[PDB]
Structure formats: C-alpha cells, structure tokens
Amino acid sequence: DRPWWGLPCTVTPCFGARLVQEGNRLHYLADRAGIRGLFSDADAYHLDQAFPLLMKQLELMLTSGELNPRHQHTVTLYAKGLTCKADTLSSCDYVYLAVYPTPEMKNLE
Ligand SMILES: [Cl-]
Ligand SMILES: [Mg+2]
C-alpha cells in the first residue's frame, strides 16, 4: 500500500505531504502525499480549497523565518474546520505537513 509522507500524526482521517523546500519556495508533489482514512465530503472540499492558501502561508513563514529548515519547530495553521501542522523537522530539504479535521471537544459540546 502507500507509505506516509506527512508530519507524524495519529489523527484520522489525515492528509499528509512532504513539500520540497527550495529557498522560500515550497513545491507540492502528489506522489509525496496521501490520505489516511476517509474525509467527509465537506472536509475534503475545504482541504482542497484551502491548500493553495496553506502553501502560501507556509512560504510566508519561510521568508519571515518562522519556519526554519535547520530547526525542528511545529507551526499551526487553520482552515474551515481543519487544523494544519507543518515542520521542516530540521531537514534542510522539506516541510512536512499534516492536515486533519479539527477535533471536536466532545466533553464540552
Ligand atoms: Cl505518523
Ligand atoms: Mg520547523
């Protein structure tokens, strides 16, 4: 079956991808991405629509320095009902990401 390329994550469902990091530019590779589980139709749609924005935000953070290729540091971003985690994992080559439905706090809801 397919291997996992994204940021370590136990949430299900989850979209994981390993982005090629070149300078302050990020490159998405479909063959270096995949999904664990099944996204509701609503989530799959929001994931797809927000991906370009997410990419841009991550590059902004590279340009600004928040995301550093030589340091392990996890940043958090949001999108309609989705949580996006990203980290270079000090790889000096990539930005690993994990996007999943924001967990519901069942005990408070
Ligand atoms: Cl994992
Ligand atoms: Mg980092």
Swiss-Prot record:
Cofactor comment text: Binds 1 Mg(2+) ion per subunit.
Induction remarks: Expressed in mid-log phase at considerably lower levels than antitoxin relB.
Source species, domain of life: Bacteria
Primary localization class, coarse: cytoplasm
Keywords: Cytoplasm, Magnesium, Metal-binding, Toxin-antitoxin system
Disruption phenotype: Single deletion has no effect on expression of cognate toxin cbtA i.e. the probable operon is not autoregulatory. Deletion of 3 type IV antitoxin genes (cbeA, yafW, yfjZ) has no effect on cell growth.
InterPro entries: Antitoxin_CbeA (IPR009320), CbeA_sf (IPR038025)
UniProt subcellular location: Cytoplasm
Binding site for Mg(2+): H71, H73, D87
Keyword Magnesium: yes
GO biological-process terms attached to the record: negative regulation of cell killing; positive regulation of cytoskeleton organization
MF (Gene Ontology): cytoskeletal protein binding; metal ion binding
Gene3D superfamilies registered for this protein in UniProt: PAS domain
Cofactor(s) recorded in Swiss-Prot or TrEMBL: Mg(2+)
GO CC entries: cytoplasm
Function text: Antitoxin component of a type IV toxin-antitoxin (TA) system. Antitoxin that counteracts the effect of its cognate toxin CbtA (YeeV). It does not bind to the toxin but instead binds to MreB and FtsZ (the toxin targets), enhancing their polymerization by forming higher-order bundles; it is probably retained in the MreB and FtsZ filament bundles. The mechanism has been proposed to require intergenic DNA, in cis, between the cbeA (yeeU) and cbta (yeeV) genes. The intergenic region was not found to be necessary in another study.
Note: Encoded in prophage CP4-44.
Family to which this protein belongs: Belongs to the CbeA/YafW/YfjZ antitoxin family.
Assembly, per entry: Homodimer. Interacts with polymerized and monomeric MreB and polymerized FtsZ.
Protein name: Cytoskeleton bundling-enhancing antitoxin CbeA
Taxonomic lineage from the root: Bacteria, Pseudomonadati, Pseudomonadota, Gammaproteobacteria, Enterobacterales
